[PDB]
Amino acid sequence: QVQLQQPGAELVRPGSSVKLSCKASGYTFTSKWMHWVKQRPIQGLEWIGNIDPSDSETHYNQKFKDKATLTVDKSSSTAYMQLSSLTSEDSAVYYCARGVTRGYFDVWGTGTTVTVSSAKTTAPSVYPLAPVCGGTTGSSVTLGCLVKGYFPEPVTLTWNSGSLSSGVHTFPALLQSGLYTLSSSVTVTSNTWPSQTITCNVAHPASSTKVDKKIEPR
Amino acid sequence: QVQLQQPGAELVRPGSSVKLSCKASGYTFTSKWMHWVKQRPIQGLEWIGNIDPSDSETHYNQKFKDKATLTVDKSSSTAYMQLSSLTSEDSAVYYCARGVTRGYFDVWGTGTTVTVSSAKTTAPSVYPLAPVCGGTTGSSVTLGCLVKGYFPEPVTLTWNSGSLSSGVHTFPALLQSGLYTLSSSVTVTSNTWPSQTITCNVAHPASSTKVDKKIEPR
Amino acid sequence: QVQLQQPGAELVRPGSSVKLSCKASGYTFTSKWMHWVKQRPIQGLEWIGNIDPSDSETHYNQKFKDKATLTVDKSSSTAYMQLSSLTSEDSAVYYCARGVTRGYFDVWGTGTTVTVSSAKTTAPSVYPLAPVCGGTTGSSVTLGCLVKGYFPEPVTLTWNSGSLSSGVHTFPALLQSGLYTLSSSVTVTSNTWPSQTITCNVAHPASSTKVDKKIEPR
Amino acid sequence: QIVLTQSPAIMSASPGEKVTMTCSASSSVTYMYWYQQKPGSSPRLLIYDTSNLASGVPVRFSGSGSGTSYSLTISRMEAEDAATYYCQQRTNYPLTFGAGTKLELKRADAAPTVSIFPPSSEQLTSGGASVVCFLNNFYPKDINVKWKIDGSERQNGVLNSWTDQDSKDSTYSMSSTLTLTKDEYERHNSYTCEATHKTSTSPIVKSFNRNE
Amino acid sequence: QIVLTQSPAIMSASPGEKVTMTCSASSSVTYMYWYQQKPGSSPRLLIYDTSNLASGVPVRFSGSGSGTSYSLTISRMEAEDAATYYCQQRTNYPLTFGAGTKLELKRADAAPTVSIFPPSSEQLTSGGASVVCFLNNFYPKDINVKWKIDGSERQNGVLNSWTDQDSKDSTYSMSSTLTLTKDEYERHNSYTCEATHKTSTSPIVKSFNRNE
Amino acid sequence: QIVLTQSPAIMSASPGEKVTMTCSASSSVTYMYWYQQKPGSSPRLLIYDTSNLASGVPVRFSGSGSGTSYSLTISRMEAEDAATYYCQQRTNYPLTFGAGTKLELKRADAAPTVSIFPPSSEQLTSGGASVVCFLNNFYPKDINVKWKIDGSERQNGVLNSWTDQDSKDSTYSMSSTLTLTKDEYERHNSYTCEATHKTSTSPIVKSFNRNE
Are C157 and C202 in contact, with CB atoms under 8 Å apart? yes
DSSP output for A12-65: E-TTS-EEE--EEESS-TTTSEEEEEEEETTTEEEEEEEEEETTEEEEE-GGGT
The backbone torsions φ and ψ at residue F125, rounded to the nearest 5 degrees and listed phi first, read -65, -45
C118–chain F nearest CA distance, Å: 22
Beta-carbon count within 10 A of B89 CB: 10
Nearest of E196, E21, E23 to residue E111 by alpha carbon: E196
CA distance F90 to F167: 35
Q: Rounded to 5 degrees, what are φ and ψ at D100?
A: 120, 105
Question: How far apart, in whole angstroms, are the C-alpha atoms of residue E171 and residue A143?
Answer: 19
Question: How close, in Å, is residue E68 to chain A by CA atoms?
Answer: 18
Cβ contacts of residue C102 below 8 Å, gap of 6+? C33, C50, C59, F90, F93
Helices H / strands E in chain A, number of each: 0, 18
Can you list the alpha helix ranges (DSSP code H) found in chain A? none
- Closest CB to D96 among B47, B95, B130: B47
Alpha carbon distances (Å) from E88 to A19, A104, E1: 27, 8, 12
B50, β-bridge pairs: B35, B59
DSSP state string for D131-182: EEEEEEEEBSS-EEEEEEETTEEE-TTEEEEEPPPPSSS--EEEEEEEEEEH
> Is residue A184 classed as helix, strand or coil in its secondary structure?
strand
- Report the C-alpha gap between C173 and C156 in whole angstroms: 12
**What span, in angstroms and rounded, lies between the C-alpha atoms of C44 and F34?**
14
Return d(Cα B34, Cα B2) in angstroms, integer.
13
Distance CA E211, CA E19 (A): 55
Strand runs labelled E in chain C: 3-5, 9-12, 18-20, 23-25, 33-40, 44-53, 56-60, 68-72, 79-83, 92-99, 112-116, 127-129, 140-150, 156-159, 168-176, 179-189, 199-204, 209-214
Phi, psi of F122 (to 5 degrees): -70, -35
Q: Is the dihedral of CA D49, D51, D52, D53 positive or negative?
A: positive
Q: Do B203 and B213 form a contact (C-beta atoms < 8 A)? A: no
Using alpha carbons only, how large is chain D's radius of gyration in Å?
A: 23
Task: Pick the closest to residue B82 from B109, B119, B49, B41 (CA basis).
Answer: B49
Alpha-carbon Rg for chain A, nearest whole angstrom, is 23
CATH code of the domain occupying D108-210: 2.60.40.10
- Which residues, at least 6 apart from A211, have a Cβ–Cβ distance to it below 8 Å? A124, A126, A201, A202, A203
Distance CA E208, CA E148 (A): 11
B61-to-B65, B69, C151, D25, D94 alpha-carbon distances in Å: 7, 11, 86, 19, 7
Which of A127, A157, A170, A179 best probes binding to E when mutated, by most E CB atoms within 10 angstroms? A127
Do domains B1-118 and B119-218 share one topology? The answer is: yes
What CATH number should be reported for the domain whose range is C1-118?
Answer: 2.60.40.10
Residue C26: burial class (beta carbons within 10 Å; 0-12, 13-18, 19+): exposed
CA C55 to chain centre: 35
HSE of C122 in the Cβ direction (CA atoms, 13 Å)? 16
Distance between CA E196 and CA E203 in Å, rounded? 5
Angstrom distance (rounded) from CA C142 to CA E45? 55
**Sequence-ordered list of residues with C-beta below 8 angstroms from that of D126, at least 6 positions apart, any chain:** none
Strand pairing category for A112-116 and A9-12? parallel
DSSP code, position E33: E
Interchain CB contact of F202 with D (< 8 Å): no
Domain with CATH 2.60.40.10 in chain D: 1-107, 108-210
Contact at 8 Å (CB) between A172 and E161?
Answer: yes
SS3 state of residue A113:
strand
N-to-C CA span, chain D? 62
* Contact yes or no for B121/B207 (Cβ under 8 A): yes
CB distance D63 to D34 below 8 Å? yes
Cα dihedral: C146, C151, C152, C157 (round 10): -20
The full DSSP string for chain F is: ---EEEE-SEEEE-TTS-EEEEEEEEEEES-EEEEEE-TTS--EEEEETTTEEPTT--TTEEEEEEEEEEEEEESS--GGG-SEEEEEE-SSSS--B---EEEEE----B--EEEEEPPPHHHHHHTEEEEEEEEEEEBSS-EEEEEEETTEEE-TTEEEEEPPPPSSS--EEEEEEEEEEHHHHHH--EEEEEEEETTEEEEEEEEEES--
Give the sign of the dihedral formed by CA E14, CA E15, CA E17, CA E20.
positive
List C-alpha distances in Å: A44 to A174, B115, E84, E100.
19, 67, 10, 7
Write the Ramachandran bin of F124: left for phi over 0, alpha for psi from -120 to 50, otherwise beta: alpha
Q: In whole angstroms, what is the distance from residue C209 CA to residue F86 CA?
A: 39
CATH superfamily, domain D1-107, is Immunoglobulins (2.60.40.10)
Number of C-beta neighbours around residue A178 at 10 A:
13
Following DSSP, what letter does each residue of D87-134 receive, concatenated? EEE-SSSS--B---EEEEE----B--EEEEEPPPHHHHHHTEEEEEEE
Residue F201 contacts D where some CB pair is shorter than 8 Å: yes
Handedness of CA E135, E137, E141, E142 (dihedral sign): negative
**Phi–psi pair at E166, nearest 5 degrees:** -65, 145
**Does residue E95 sit at the D interface (CB-CB below 8 Å)?**
no
CA C154 to mean position of chain CA atoms: 7
CA distance E208 to chain A (A): 8
Largest interatomic CA distance in chain D: 69
Sheet holding A209-214: strands in order across?
Answer: A156-159, A199-204, A209-214
Which strand (E) or helix (H) includes residue A159? strand A156-159
Cα D179 from chain centroid (whole Å): 24
In whole angstroms, what is the distance from residue A116 CA to residue A38 CA? Answer: 14
Asked if E15 is an interface residue toward chain D (Cβ–Cβ < 8 A), one would say: no
Contact C48, F97 (CB under 8 A): no
Are the Cβ atoms of F136 and C111 closer than 8 angstroms?
no
At D31, phi and psi to the nearest 5?
A: -130, 145
Cα–Cα–Cα angle for E128, E129, E134, nearest 5°?
140
Determine the residue among E7, E10, E20, E71 to mutate to test chain F binding: the one whose Cβ has the most chain F Cβ atoms within 10 Å.
Answer: E20
Closest CA to B28 of B1, B60, B50: B1
Q: How far apart are CA F195 and CA F136, in angstroms?
A: 11
- How many angstroms separate the CA atoms of E203 and E114, rounded? 11
At the topology level, CATH places domain C119-218 in: Immunoglobulin-like (2.60.40)
Amino acid identity, position C176 = Q
- Nearest-neighbour CA in chain A from E164: distance (Å): 9
Written as one letter, the residue type at C146 is L
The whole-angstrom separation of Cα D150 and Cα D211 is 13
CA distances to B52, D4, D36, D41 from D48, rounded to whole Å, are: 20, 16, 12, 20
Q: How far is CA D103 from CA B46, B203, D8, D56, D79, in A?
A: 20, 34, 10, 20, 11
Per DSSP, C100 falls in state S
What are the boundaries of each domain within chain B? 1-118, 119-218
Could you say which of E8, E20, E201 has the minimum Cβ distance to residue F111?
A: E201
Instruction: Specify which residues C135 forms β-bridges with.
Output: none
Please write down the HEC assignment for all residues of C9-55.
Answer: EEEECCCCCEEECCEEECCCCCCCEEEEEEEECCCEEEEEEEEEECC
Separation between Cα atoms, residue C208 and residue C218, nearest integer Å: 30
